[PDB]
Design a protein around this nucleic acid. Structure first.
Lengths: 105, 199, 76
RNA sequence: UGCUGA
DNA sequence: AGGACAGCGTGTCAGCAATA
DNA sequence: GTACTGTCCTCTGG
């Protein structure tokens, strides 16, 4: 998810809007370096062949896509989870009313 | 014998869907009545059709009518094998209750090697394209979209959008990134023409 | 070269306004005014005679522009 | 906050 | 994943007294 | 006022 979203943002910054679903499907059809090299080749090819479009990216249909992507990220992938590398890395931050964040043992 | 009425309606709708995509279909198939459908053909494996394309005679399509009311990954593989061996690329799977949810992402997983697509049976009982309010859609060719963008000084984004799951984008089998011309019959101007990028 | 040949009403309004703001700032009047103290009446007198050396720069929605002459524009 | 005018 | 729910929202138009 | 988004909230799937 991290690398997919990174590449989708890299392509959105220049306006390429088909690259979004193309990257997602390239991913689904496919280690961590392995995923990065699979996606970064296509993303760099897009950002290079489709530059000159940083001025033509501030249009509706390019802002809706970025909005939706970042909103879905913040909404679905930032929940407390058991940690990948060490299975016991949930030092549960759990914030009370504003001005209060409490980590546990 | 209502199963036969449903089979006949679905077969007529699929013949119309295949003709609207530009496949070689005869007038009799498009004007076939029930009495002669049941005369010819009972089963759900001899309703499978294989159609050819106007151009690219190798480019043909294959319509399936699975028996399982809820098709699964194994059912999909069993005739993805048929397609891979008969040397076809496209398919069309008419399902009676739905596809188990893992199957939908499998059909998507099969790369342009073997591109499939599903249709519910209740979605084919009538041709939505023949509704009063539904305009005529026309998949533009790669050389007409360029002239459009050049005439209006547009970009491909910055054009109205049509969803890739739109009931009339799924029917005309339009992939993503394709522009479709739409001829709205307007009470004001007669035959207004619009364009929508499929995404 | 592809836009309409006529002068839209918004263009007439802005051209009259600009010519009037110029006349009022002591600009030479090429129309032989005949005792009128309004710069807008003088600007209309000039527009009717086809003496306004201004270039309407019509902008298209992608940045591309087309430069028309106020003389080469059909005033309705 | 209590009033008032379209 | 079926929910339960807590969470933001706006609201035509100008005057006067009077008082925070 | 109601209806929307949102917000998880954590319950059966590999």
């Amino acid at each position: 998810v991290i690398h997919l979203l990174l590449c989708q943002l890299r392509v959105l910054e220049v306006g390429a809007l088909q690259a979004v679903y193309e990257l997602e499907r390239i991913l689904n059809r496919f280690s961590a370096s392995e995923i990065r090299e699979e996606l970064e080749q296509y993303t760099t090819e897009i950002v290079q062949n489709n530059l000159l479009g940083s001025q033509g990216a501030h249009v509706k249909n390019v802002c809706e896509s970025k909005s939706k992507l970042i909103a879905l990220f913040w909404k679905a992938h930032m929940n407390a989870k058991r940690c990948p590398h060490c299975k016991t890395g949930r030092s549960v931050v759990r914030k009370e009313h504003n001005s209060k964040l409490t980590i546990t043992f | 014998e209502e199963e036969t009425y449903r089979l006949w309606k679905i077969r007529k709708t699929i013949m119309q869907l295949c003709h609207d995509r530009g496949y070689l279909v005869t007038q009799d198939e498009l004007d076939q009545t029930l009495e002669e459908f049941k005369a010819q053909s009972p089963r759900r494996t001899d309703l499978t059709v294989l159609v050819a394309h106007n151009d690219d005679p190798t480019d043909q399509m294959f319509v399936f009518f699975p028996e399982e009311p809820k098709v699964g990954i194994k059912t999909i593989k069993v005739y993805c094998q048929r397609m891979q061996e008969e040397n076809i690329t496209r398919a069309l799977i008419v399902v009676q209750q739905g596809m188990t949810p893992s199957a939908k992402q499998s059909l998507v997983d099969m790369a342009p090697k073997y591109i499939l697509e599903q249709f519910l049976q209740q979605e084919l009982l009538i041709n939505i394209t023949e509704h009063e309010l539904v305009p005529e859609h026309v998949v533009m060719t790669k050389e007409e979209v360029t002239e459009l963008l050049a005439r209006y000084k547009l970009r491909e984004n910055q054009l109205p959008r049509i969803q890739a799951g739109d009931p009339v984008a799924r029917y005309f089998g339009i992939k993503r990134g394709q522009v479709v011309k739409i001829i709205r019959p307007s009470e004001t101007a007669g035959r207004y023409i619009t364009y929508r990028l499929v995404q | 070269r592809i836009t309409t040949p006529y002068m839209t009403k918004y263009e007439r309004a802005r051209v009259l306004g600009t010519r009037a703001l110029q006349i009022a700032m002591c600009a030479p009047v090429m129309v032989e005014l005949e005792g009128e103290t309004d710069p807008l009446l003088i600007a209309m007198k000039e527009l009717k005679a086809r003496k306004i050396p201004i270039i309407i720069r019509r902008y298209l929605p992608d940045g591309s522009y087309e430069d028309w002459g106020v003389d080469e524009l059909i005033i309705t």
